[PDB]
Design a protein around this ligand. Sequence first.
Ligand SMILES: [Mg+2]
Ligand SMILES: [Zn+2]
Ligand SMILES: [Zn+2]
Ligand SMILES: [Zn+2]
Lengths: 243, 48, 45, 335, 45, 50, 50, 49, 400, 67, 104
Amino acid sequence: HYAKIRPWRTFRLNECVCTPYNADFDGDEMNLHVPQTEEARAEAINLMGVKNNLLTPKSGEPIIAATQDFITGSYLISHKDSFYDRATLTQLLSMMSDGIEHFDIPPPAIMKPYYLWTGKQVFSLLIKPNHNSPVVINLDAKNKVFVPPKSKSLPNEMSQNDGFVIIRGSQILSGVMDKSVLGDGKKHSVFYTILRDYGPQEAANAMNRMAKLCARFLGNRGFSIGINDVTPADDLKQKKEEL
Amino acid sequence: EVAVPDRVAKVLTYPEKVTRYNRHKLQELIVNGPNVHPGANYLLKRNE
Amino acid sequence: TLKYICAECSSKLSLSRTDAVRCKDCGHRILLKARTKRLVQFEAR
Amino acid sequence: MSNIVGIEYNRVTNTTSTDFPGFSKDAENEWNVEKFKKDFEVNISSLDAREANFDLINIDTSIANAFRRIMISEVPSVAAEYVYFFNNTSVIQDEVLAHRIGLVPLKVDPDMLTWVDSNLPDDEKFTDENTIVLSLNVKCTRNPDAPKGSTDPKELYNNAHVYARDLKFEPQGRQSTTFADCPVVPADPDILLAKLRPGQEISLKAHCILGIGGDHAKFSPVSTASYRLLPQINILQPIKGESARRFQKCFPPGVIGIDEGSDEAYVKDARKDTVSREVLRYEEFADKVKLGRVRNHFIFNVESAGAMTPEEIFFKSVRILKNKAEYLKNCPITQ
Amino acid sequence: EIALFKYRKARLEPGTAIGAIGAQSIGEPGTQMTLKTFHASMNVT
Amino acid sequence: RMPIMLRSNKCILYDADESKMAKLNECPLDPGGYFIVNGTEKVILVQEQL
Amino acid sequence: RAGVTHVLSRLSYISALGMMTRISSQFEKSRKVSGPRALQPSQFGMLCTA
Amino acid sequence: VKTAETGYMSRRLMKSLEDLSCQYDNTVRTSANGIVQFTYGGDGLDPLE
Amino acid sequence: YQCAMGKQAIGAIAYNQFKRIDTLLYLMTYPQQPMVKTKTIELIDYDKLPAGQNATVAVMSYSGYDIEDALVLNKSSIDRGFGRCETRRKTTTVLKRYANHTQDIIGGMRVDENGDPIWQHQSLGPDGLGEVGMKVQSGQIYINKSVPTNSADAPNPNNVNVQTQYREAPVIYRGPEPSHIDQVMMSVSDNDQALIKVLLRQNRRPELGDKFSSRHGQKGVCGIIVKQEDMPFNDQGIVPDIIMNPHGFPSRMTVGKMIELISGKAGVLNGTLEYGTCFGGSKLEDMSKILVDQGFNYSGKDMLYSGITGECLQAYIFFGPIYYQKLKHMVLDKMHARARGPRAVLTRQPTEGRSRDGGLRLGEMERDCVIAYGASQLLLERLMISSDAFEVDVCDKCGL
Amino acid sequence: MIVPVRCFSCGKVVGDKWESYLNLLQEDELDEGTALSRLGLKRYCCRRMILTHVDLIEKFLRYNPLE
Amino acid sequence: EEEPDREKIKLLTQATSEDGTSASFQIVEEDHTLGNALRYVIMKNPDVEFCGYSIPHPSENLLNIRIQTYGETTAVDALQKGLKDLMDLCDVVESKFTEKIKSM
Ligand SMILES: [Mg+2]
Ligand SMILES: [Zn+2]
Ligand SMILES: [Zn+2]
Ligand SMILES: [Zn+2]
């Protein structure tokens, strides 16, 4: 994949393409070869590049996808209560797609009792931002933490914690994304659907778009592990010895 | 996109032979020097 | 030019060529060269 | 929407700006001369010669960030950059002692200087008022008495500990009538720069340049500059019991207190209480006391390194943001 | 049209070195597990 | 000739404290226990057997 | 026997105490079987477990 | 202890499957023009797509 | 994983640390004691010569440059001297007499006459060996040496000419960064073989690519370097030194670091250094009583602001002092590249390893991967054209 | 070595508060925290460098080229 | 030396849609200081509907703002309205501060 000339003397690249290398930025160094003739340079990028090899051969699952700070920033925008104003939304959509992008803002989730967009409408502009962007993908996907609903209701999405992803026309109607909707190792994902339908270029373009948002907003919001979340709250401490 | 530093690229060099689209670019680049980064190190002649 | 501080007596003594390197005061073996007279610059960074 | 930022036991809420037009149905309050002048007060608290305390009320967190972010980055100050050594025969390595001379605050005004031109050769920019020379020269001799005590070498050896006041000043051919009333002595003379032994000697002529804190942190005039929203303690369900004296244990010995009897539990100004949320974890108490800070009241608590007084630091921080809007309004847009 | 286009791009392309793909497809040593039984004996590799 | 490892009975660092280690130019906090032949210092890794 | 006397590792203060106090490796080279290589409950007071 | 033994295992599995590619008549063949399968996997479909 | 890393970090090796000419040793400018003294590192005197610095860490997901095990540092803290290094190397040579009583003599100083001196002899001194604080950079000669080109073998001593036949053969400093000289030294061996031990040293700033520890088996390279008007501040003005990612906590299960932060934060506020020994030490129950006495949270989580936008963070940040170490394996020494250098004598291959020249290797398990792509014209370049291409004359019939 | 002149995170001059701290702990012996709070080191980042500070330049002066 | 810094603001022609009403600009040599302090002021213009700064890479010294507005306004004129307006804000903060520091 293509070169770029930068400051301090170390190789540096993305984190979505980090799982086939089995890299972990530990101190592990990697070597880099250049082509010298046109005949091998024009085939090193065409059938051996990154954007064509988004899958694995052994299963047919997307092998370059979400990483650690990629779905934990994607989960905190969608927990049914991240409600954004105009001024926060324009800053999110600006930090998402740094340079050239038009956005043609949708109507908000709630009207006159103060105008507050949801997080799914912030996230659905990452898939189809323009009116000219042809990404009209749609799918129906589970997640890992799925508790079943009340067993009398009909659909598979009336459950307790966000349930079941329903995308209908590049708009998310229910559910957090949460690992195998964009999560490295199963099918029926978002970036598998864009790659399967609308080429590899739009799939690599909409996946560069997620990394900027999850790099700026996850540090802008704040997220930590303390000591008060590893302690039992005296009922486990009362019950564990007697059990 | 991988991002290589500005010193590996001074010692990693690609043979770009000159033909009518390279000529106006590989002439401003050959006066630039091996030290300044948009430049060149060697030059092989027509007679080799 | 009054260099080569000895390593044990710390005596500043110059030696001539075609001679065994030692300190003429005591007889110690190892001895180290004096700091230069020249100038050197450094940035506070 | 509810300007008080809320504080719960595991999160905060109501953080964002929520004061822009096109928000519910009516536009508010776009600029409205003079509604921002009508609602801007400042109250300067106890102001020393090195530390200043003052608060700005009814502004947002964008223009109060930019004053803070300028105040330790973009304001110019002055510090030693190039050090020229002559016979450094001490134990300390030659860059370590050159790194300690850069990090001393030199008490001189950075208005009696000009900026350096980083294009000229060596003997063309160390001219008049662009560069200050500072000379250090010290040699350790043996104190000939040394009666009975074997201590640190203030009695056994003369001047074995060198200080920041040894950085003497030599005026050049022009800056001898301009720096006559005030020297270029450092801010703290008792800075332990090096300790050494007889037979050792250091001597150097260190130049001194003007710069900003974005390149190197030795050009920052402020120790630390920050703000603090003042909390408020909204009290409700005014029952007191014996737990009113327990309610003043979980706070510092300032902010709250009780009157004669108990009868209630009041609160003084909440400028002393660090938000510690100790009263948010008692399982019988989280229905009568809520905690929260006010978003539009920023208590600046800035300090100084010794070069300039902090009100001059804040005045220069406000003035240089107005200049970088001049320079953007008066420029043409080249497509 | 979609169901025939996805089957159009589903057949194997002529010229794929698919023996070399399948040789390092089954060579995935990420198992490292030793299974057993309980309520015991009869270990099996 | 028989090289003697440091801090032994037949060594000079035996019974040294705060004045002789500084005069003989050696740190008094190293463990010792090593040989020094041909300039470099070398240890003997203790071998176990059955 | 080769590889019994090594040069003393001097990187920090504790690397000189890691070359010191270090029992070596004898035979039963153990390519595939982890018999003489795994940790045993018998080395409680001696032969540090970490 | 495991990675070297399976490094020898994936090495030798290469060489017996190395020159074995699908031809233009939808048949996979060996190096010496000998045939092994008349269609790939009995189905003739790409395992990736 | 820490036992293979405590004996790997840089430190404060000995008291005679500057009067020794080891072939390679790393130093550190401002060492600091650990805040949590184990009750057995006081016995082995680790608090006398420590191997790292305390850093006010802030465990939070920040800036995106800390996704997988790569902590980010403060610019204005390295700028004030956080973790400064000094790599110190020896490049000694010996000079000996030959069989026919003809030794080699060091010398030089070609004044060049509109010159004074040559750039190759720029920092060399009038004796022949370099000075005690001049600067060398990648071309300069400092240990200039000249052997006799005739008495290398053993002829009989011809009295018509003995001495005056010399061949200049010094060794040149060949490094990427400039270093300084401080311990040029002359001595003599047992058989009157004079040797000169020169000691080079350079100051190494912590920059992008250096790795750090945590005393708890947590490796990690530098993510980026970033300014102080960035990383967030509390009510008192503390900005962090290093920001760690919390994702390295659950799968590594290292909650001992998560007790270390609150035991070291109360150790500063009380003043006394506290203990972290095995199966005991300082209890957590009488630890956080110091926190609520000072005016802090029970759990050591105070609310931070944001340096990039001003408004306070949505969560509570677990920040406090944790002792970090700096290891070996700096990116200045790991950096390595080669375009077209010397070849091998036997097989005409690019030479092996580092410090001869580069040329890296494509293994047998790598050509397996490029066959799976099907690119056949890349195997002609990366195995024949680039490495070893040699024209040859073969015959048609009875082909040899 | 010698105490650093300026703290790493906060950034105030603290290397001037070592000689006056050392004569305040030896003579008329206070505690540790009260002595560190007497000299004006309030926040814990400016306190942890006078507190920690292995004394190492005094150990390196046992040798000298003066004898 | 009277050249008014042509290396400052560059109207990105690949981002401007109509030739008006939507524009992306490009500073040289700024940071997060003038970013949020200007997009707070531009958002108070009641004819805009999108404003936000973005640094593409911290190794560079750049920032890209993007202004999108409604009808009857130019996106260049919405920047100039919000950039003169920050001057009055810094003038009224400077005035109220110096009238209280001389009293104490
Ligand atoms: Mg690794
Ligand atoms: Zn002597
Ligand atoms: Zn023939
Ligand atoms: Zn501090």
